[PDB]
Amino acid sequence: MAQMQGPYNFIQDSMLDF
Amino acid sequence: LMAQMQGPYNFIQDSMLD
Amino acid sequence: EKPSPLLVGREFVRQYYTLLNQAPDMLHRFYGKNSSYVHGGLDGKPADAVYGQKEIHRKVMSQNFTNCHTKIRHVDAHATLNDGVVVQVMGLLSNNNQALRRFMQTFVLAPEGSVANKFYVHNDIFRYQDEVFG
Amino acid sequence: SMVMEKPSPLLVGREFVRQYYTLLNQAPDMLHRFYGKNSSYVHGGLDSNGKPADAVYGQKEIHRKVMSQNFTNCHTKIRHVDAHATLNDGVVVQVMGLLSNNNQALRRFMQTFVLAPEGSVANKFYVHNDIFRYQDEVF
């Protein structure tokens, strides 16, 4: 999750209900 | 061509070339 | 109703590769002022976009499209931003009765905004496979 | 501290493609988070008729399908990436590379993405569109 560091953010909240 | 290019949707704009 | 994206997609694609074949100097009629076009090319790197009919009419001819044959082997279209349609075409294209070449192609179609069932190409991304898998 | 990078279509496409294929490989059970309620997804396949497979919508559906294609130690060579401005400040990305899965064979892929502005946070995007086809499956 250190590799997902960048100038722009593509990662959203999880709509996975459970 | 003119007959052949007729279809249910249109994709042809006006020729914008002065 | 809001058109079917694949109905729209197959139809643009048969229209597109008909004109490319028959009247490729009229191929610019598909684009607007701000539409991206890149149809393959090594400089020697993969080539850059050009914007709007006038810049597009140009590049089109800068490629000597002659007796241009195409076998479209798959089309996939889908609803996208602002009742637009993203289109992914795979197929083989022969120019000037030379080699038959595998291509990837992406199109974004945007409603014209005036007549319903009218669209225009916002975006056009073509690549010859032989220029990338060397 | 650091001022924000402008959302240069090519930079957004390059940064998103390293994350996409990094997270596919290291964590495919998370890959469902790049997507939104509306998002559309298709990733190869040849249905009963032997023709290319249908697509699904929203995170849950997409996750479902991602988990069903068992991605183990999925490696990716990426041999070209094209990214252009599209509607409503959205970025359309054409990706050409090879994907080996489970140390099975490196097959060549054609892949269209559309990244959309996310609306709430600056420089934040969601994958509106994810069309992935293998070439052996089509040629």
Residue numbers in the entry:
A (entry chain D): 4 to 21
B (entry chain C): 3 to 20
C (entry chain A): 4 to 46, 49 to 139
D (entry chain B): 0 to 138
What text does the study give?
G3BP1/2 are paralogous proteins that promote stress granule formation in response to cellular stresses, including viral infection. G3BP1/2 are paralogous proteins that share a domain architecture consisting of an N-terminal NTF2-like (NTF2L) domain that underlies protein homodimerization, two intrinsically disordered regions in the center of the protein (IDR1 and IDR2), and a C-terminal RNA-binding domain composed of a folded RNA recognition motif in tandem with an arginine-glycine-rich IDR3. The NTF2L domain harbors the binding site for several types of proteins, including host proteins that regulate SG assembly (e.g., caprin 157 and USP1058) and viral proteins (e.g., non-structural protein 3 [nsP3] of alphaviruses). Most of these interactions occur in a mutually exclusive manner via a common binding pocket in G3BP1/2 NTF2L.
For instance, caprin 1 and USP10 show mutually exclusive binding to NTF2L, with antagonistic effects on SG formation. To determine whether these interactors compete with the N protein for binding to NTF2L, we synthesized three peptides derived from the G3BP1-interacting motifs of caprin 1 (aas 361–381), USP10 (aas 1–25), and nsP3 (aas 449–473) from SFV. All three peptides competed against the NTF2L-N interaction in a dose-dependent manner, with the nsP3–25mer peptide showing the most effective competition for binding to the N protein. The mutually exclusive binding by the N protein and other G3BP1 interactors suggested that these proteins may bind to the same site on NTF2L. However, the primary aa sequences of G3BP1-interacting motifs vary considerably and lack a conserved motif. Thus, we used crystallography to examine whether a shared interaction mode might exist at the three-dimensional level. Indeed, after overlaying the structures of all NTF2L-interacting peptides, we found that the side chain of the inserted phenylalanines of different peptides adopted a nearly identical conformation.
